[PDB]
C-alpha cells in the first residue's frame, strides 16, 4: 500500500479504488480526482468506507476520521475530521488530463490523442488503463461451439445467444478448448488451427484475454546527446553497400535514442542490418511487435551477418510458424531477433525496434523494461499503418498520436529519413510522395508504364460488415484476360470478404492492405471495394499502392484518391 503518486510522484498510501488500474494519488491530487469525477472510492491499508456496522457509505467526500476509523455524516463521532477539505484527501505524507484518462471508455480518437500528449507517467497510466479495458472487452463476446466438420479447412459454428459475435478475421486470434489457438474466415467458414487437431464437434472456443501487467519504464528513455560515439566501436572498412548510412550510424552512436522514418522500400531493414556491420562488436537485439517483422529482419541478417551469432527467440507457446534458420532461444547470442512480448530480461549495446508505427505505448514501455541498452533505434514510418485499436469506433487517429515515437516524427521530425524509394515504379513513388511525404520521397526506378487506375464504383454488398464489390472483381477478371503477365499478381483490398470472393473468382493470391504491410510483389491488383473512412485512409492507401515493384492496377471507388493516382487511366 506504500506508493508514489502517478501525477506528482509525492509518496502516499491513497490509491483510487474506482480507477481500473488503482493508481497511487497524493493528498492534493486524490482530492482533485474525487471532486471532479464519478470516482469516490479511496484505498490505503484499509479502504475509506464507513466503519459503522451495515453502512454502505464508500464516497470519500461523505466520510470523516473518527479517531483512527472512518465514518459517514450519519455515524461519525462528535470529534471527527472530513477526509475531503482544503483541497486534500486525508492520508499519510500530507489533473484534468488524468481525470479524462481514468474515466474514458477508449472508444473515441480524442482518448488516444490525450494518451499521447499527456506527461510521461500519464502515458504509462493511459497505456495500462487502455490495455486492461481492451482485455475486459474480450469477455463481452459470445462463445462459439463446433456444430459440424466438413473437411481439413472448413467447418460450421454455433454461437452463444445474448452475447454479441466478434468480427471474423485473422486479426482476432481465438483460443480453442487448450487445443491450440484458432483463427476464422468467412454458411461456408474456414477453420485455421495454429496446432493441427481433429476438429471435434462440441469443443468450445474463447478469446485470449491476457492479464495486463503494470508499466514501470517510460515509452522513451530521456534523450542524451553525446560529443563522441559512446560504447560502440566502428569500422573504417564498412562495405560500400552500407556507405550511404555511415553518417546516420554515427548519429546512432552519438544519441541515447534515434528515430528513422523509412517510407516503403527506402532500405529500413538494410539500415538495421548495416548498423551491425558498422559496429561489428556490438550486441544488437532486433525487436518488433509481429513475428513477420522480426522474420523480415532475420532474412536480411541471414544475407549479411554470421549465422552462428544469430538467435531467433521463439515463445514456448509457439503460435504461428516463424524463422527456422537461426539457433532457437539462445539469449546470449550477439544478434537476438525476438518479438516485443517474447523479449527476455537482458542488456544490449544497441536495440533496434522496427515497424514503429505498429507499436503502442504499452510496447514502447515493455521494451524499455525488458532491455537495458546503450542505444535504442526506432525504425518505421508514421505514414504507414498503426496497431489495431479494437475499442476505437469514433474519430480518426492521426499518425502523431500512434505512439511516442510517431508523435516525435510528426512534431519535431525524424532524426533520420530514407528519402529514396528503390522498390516502386515512379508513378507510385510520385503519388505517395505528394500524398503523405510532403514531396520528399524520391523514385530510384523510372516509371514502369504498368501503373493503371480505373474509376469504377461497382456494387457494395456486405458479409456482416466486411464489404464485397463483385463488379470490381469482374472488372479485374476482364483485365486479366487481356493482360496475362498480371496472372502472377497479388490481389489486395481493404476487406477480408472482398479477398475471399476475389480468391475464388480470380485465383490470385490474396492479401488485405494491413497484412500486406512490409511485403512486396511485382504486380498488385487493388480494388478499393468501398469509399468508407477505412478504404480512404491515406496511410492504408499509401501501404496498398507501395507493395508493387513493377505494376499496379487500382480499381477505385473514391474520386479524390483516384484523381491523386499518377497512373494511366483505363476505360470500361
In angstroms, what is the minimal distance from the CB of 80 to Zn ion?
Answer: 11
In angstroms, what is the minimal distance from the CB of 96 to Zn ion?
Answer: 13
**Residue 118, annotated as binding a ligand:** no
Between CA 312 and CA 207 the distance in angstroms is 27
Nearest residue to the partner Zn ion, using Cβ? 29
Query: 29 or 556: whose CB is closer to Zn ion?
Result: 29
Instruction: Give the angle subtended at the CA of 218 by the CAs of 212 and 223, to the nearest 5°.
Output: 160
In angstroms, what is the minimal distance from the CB of 401 to Zn ion?
Answer: 23
Query: 57 or 122: whose CB is closer to Zn ion?
Result: 57
**Residue 180, annotated as binding a ligand:** no
In angstroms, what is the minimal distance from the CB of 113 to Zn ion?
Answer: 20
Between CA 510 and CA 540 the distance in angstroms is 16
**Residue 54, annotated as binding a ligand:** no
Query: 4 or 247: whose CB is closer to Zn ion?
Result: 4
Binding residues for Zn ion, rule: CB under 5 A, are: 5, 7-8, 16, 18-19, 26, 29, 39, 50, 52, 55, 57, 72, 75, 102
Are the CB atoms for 205 and 145 separated by under 8 Å?
yes
Instruction: Give the angle subtended at the CA of 522 by the CAs of 519 and 525, to the nearest 5°.
Output: 85
Between CA 428 and CA 5 the distance in angstroms is 51
**Residue 164, annotated as binding a ligand:** no
Query: 75 or 268: whose CB is closer to Zn ion?
Result: 75
**Residue 268, annotated as binding a ligand:** yes
DSSP string, 465-499: TEEE-HHHHHHHHHHHHH-GGGGGPEEEES-HHHH
In angstroms, what is the minimal distance from the CB of 95 to Zn ion?
Answer: 8
Between CA 470 and CA 505 the distance in angstroms is 9
Are the CB atoms for 542 and 261 separated by under 8 Å?
no
Query: 57 or 305: whose CB is closer to Zn ion?
Result: 57
**Residue 269, annotated as binding a ligand:** yes
Query: 89 or 550: whose CB is closer to Zn ion?
Result: 89
Query: 75 or 453: whose CB is closer to Zn ion?
Result: 75
Query: 50 or 435: whose CB is closer to Zn ion?
Result: 50
In angstroms, what is the minimal distance from the CB of 10 to Zn ion?
Answer: 5
In angstroms, what is the minimal distance from the CB of 539 to Zn ion?
Answer: 34
**Residue 53, annotated as binding a ligand:** no
**Residue 8, annotated as binding a ligand:** yes
In angstroms, what is the minimal distance from the CB of 495 to Zn ion?
Answer: 39
Between CA 102 and CA 133 the distance in angstroms is 11
Q: Cα separations (Å) of 13 from 61, 66, 331, 540?
A: 17, 18, 39, 47
> Where would I find the beta strands (DSSP E) of 214-357?
257-261, 284-288, 310-312, 327-328, 335-339, 346-353
Between CA 374 and CA 250 the distance in angstroms is 14
**Residue 75, annotated as binding a ligand:** yes
Q: What cell does 165 get?
A: 459475435
Q: Dihedral, CA atoms, 318, 332, 252, 267, nearest 10 degrees?
A: -40
In angstroms, what is the minimal distance from the CB of 2 to Zn ion?
Answer: 15
Query: 41 or 221: whose CB is closer to Zn ion?
Result: 41
Q: Cα separations (Å) of 63 from 18, 34, 46, 67, 99?
A: 16, 12, 14, 13, 21
**Residue 262, annotated as binding a ligand:** yes
**Residue 183, annotated as binding a ligand:** no
Q: CA nearest 366: which of 216, 211, 209?
A: 216
Largest CA distance in the chain: 93
**Residue 50, annotated as binding a ligand:** yes
Query: 127 or 373: whose CB is closer to Zn ion?
Result: 127
434's CB contacts (< 8 A; 6+ apart) are 564
Between CA 43 and CA 34 the distance in angstroms is 12
Residue numbers belonging to the annotated binding site: 5, 8, 16, 19, 26, 29, 33, 39, 50, 55, 72, 75, 262-269
Residue numbers belonging to the annotated binding site for Zn(2+): 5, 8, 16, 19, 26, 29, 33, 39, 50, 55, 72, 75
Residue numbers belonging to the annotated binding site for a ribonucleoside 5'-triphosphate: 262-269
Amino acid at each position: 500500500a506504500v506508493g508514489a503518486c502517478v501525477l506528482c510522484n509525492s509518496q502516499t498510501s491513497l490509491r483510487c479504488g474506482a480507477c481500473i488500474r488503482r493508481p497511487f494519488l497524493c493528498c492534493k491530487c486524490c482530492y482533485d480526482h474525487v471532486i471532479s469525477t464519478s470516482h469516490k472510492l479511496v484505498l490505503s491499508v484499509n479502504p475509506y468506507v464507513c466503519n459503522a456496522p451495515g453502512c454502505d457509505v464508500t464516497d470519500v467526500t461523505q466520510l470523516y476520521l473518527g479517531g483512527m476509523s472512518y465514518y459517514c455524516k450519519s455515524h461519525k463521532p462528535p470529534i471527527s475530521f472530513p477526509l475531503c477539505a482544503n483541497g486534500q484527501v486525508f492520508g499519510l505524507y500530507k489533473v484534468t488530463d488524468f481525470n479524462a484518462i481514468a474515466t474514458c471508455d477508449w472508444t473515441n480518437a480524442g482518448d488516444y490523442i490525450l494518451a499521447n500528449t499527456c506527461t510521461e507517467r500519464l502515458k504509462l497510466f493511459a497505456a495500462e488503463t487502455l490495455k486492461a479495458t481492451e482485455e475486459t472487452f474480450k469477455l463481452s463476446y459470445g462463445i462459439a461451439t463446433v456444430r459440424e466438420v466438413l473437411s481439413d479447412r472448413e467447418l460450421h459454428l454455433s454461437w452463444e445467444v445474448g452475447k454479441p459475435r466478434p468480427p471474423l478475421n485473422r486479426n482476432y486470434v481465438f483460443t480453442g478448448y487448450q487445443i491450440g489457438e484458432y483463427t476464422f474466415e468467412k454458411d461456408a467458414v474456414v477453420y485455421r488451427g495454429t496446432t493441427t487437431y481433429k476438429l471435434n464437434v462440441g469443443d468450445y472456443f474463447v478469446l485470449t484475454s491476457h492479464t495486463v501487467m503494470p508499466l514501470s519504464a517510460p515509452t522513451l528513455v530521456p534523450q542524451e546527446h553525446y560529443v563522441r560515439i559512446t560504447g560502440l566501436y566502428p569500422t573504417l572498412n564498412i562495405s560500400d553497400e552500407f556507405s550511404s548510412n555511415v553518417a546516420n550510424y554515427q548519429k546512432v552512436g552519438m544519441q541515447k535514442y534515434s528515430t528513422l522514418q523509412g517510407p516503403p522500400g527506402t532500405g529500413k531493414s538494410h539500415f538495421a542490418i548495416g548498423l551491425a556491420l558498422y559496429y561489428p562488436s556490438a550486441r544488437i537485439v532486433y525487436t518488433a511487435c509481429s513475428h513477420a517483422a522480426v522474420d523480415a529482419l532475420c532474412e536480411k541478417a541471414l544475407k549479411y551477418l554470421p549465422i552462428d551469432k544469430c538467435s531467433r527467440i521463439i515463445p514456448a507457446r509457439a503460435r504461428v510458424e516463424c524463422f527456422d534458420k537461426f539457433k532457437v532461444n539462445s539469449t546470449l547470442e550477439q544478434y537476438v531477433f525476438c518479438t516485443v512480448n517474447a523479449l527476455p530480461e537482458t542488456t544490449a549495446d544497441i536495440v533496434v525496434f522496427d515497424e514503429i508505427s505498429m507499436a503502442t505505448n504499452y510496447d514502447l514501455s515493455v521494451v524499455n523494461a525488458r532491455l537495458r541498452a546503450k542505444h535504442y533505434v526506432y525504425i518505421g514510418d508514421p505514414a504507414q499503418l498503426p496497431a489495431p485499436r479494437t475499442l476505437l469506433t469514433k474519430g480518426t487517429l492521426e499518425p502523431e498520436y500512434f505512439n511516442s515515437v510517431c508523435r516525435l516524427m510528426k512534431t519535431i521530425g525524424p532524426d533520420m529519413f530514407l528519402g529514396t524509394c528503390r522498390r516502386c515504379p515512379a508513378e507510385i513513388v510520385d503519388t505517395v510522395s505528394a500524398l503523405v511525404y510532403d514531396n520528399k520521397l524520391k523514385a530510384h526506378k523510372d516509371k514502369s508504364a504498368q501503373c493503371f487506375k480505373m474509376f469504377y464504383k461497382g456494387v457494395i454488398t456486405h458479409d456482416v460488415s466486411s464489404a464485397i464489390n463483385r463488379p470490381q472483381i469482374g472488372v479485374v477478371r476482364e483485365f486479366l484476360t487481356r493482360n496475362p503477365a498480371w496472372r502472377k499478381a497479388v490481389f489486395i483490398s481493404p476487406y477480408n470478404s472482398q479477398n475471399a470472393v476475389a480468391s475464388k473468382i480470380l485465383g490470385l493470391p490474396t492479401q488485405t492492405v494491413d497484412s500486406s504491410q512490409g511485403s512486396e510483389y511485382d504486380y498488385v491488383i487493388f480494388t478499393q471495394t468501398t469509399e468508407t473512412a477505412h478504404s480512404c485512409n491515406v496511410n492504408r492507401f499509401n501501404v496498398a499502392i507501395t507493395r508493387a515493384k513493377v505494376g499496379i492496377l487500382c480499381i477505385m471507388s473514391d474520386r479524390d484518391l483516384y484523381d491523386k493516382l499518377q497512373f494511366t487511366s483505363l476505360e470500361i
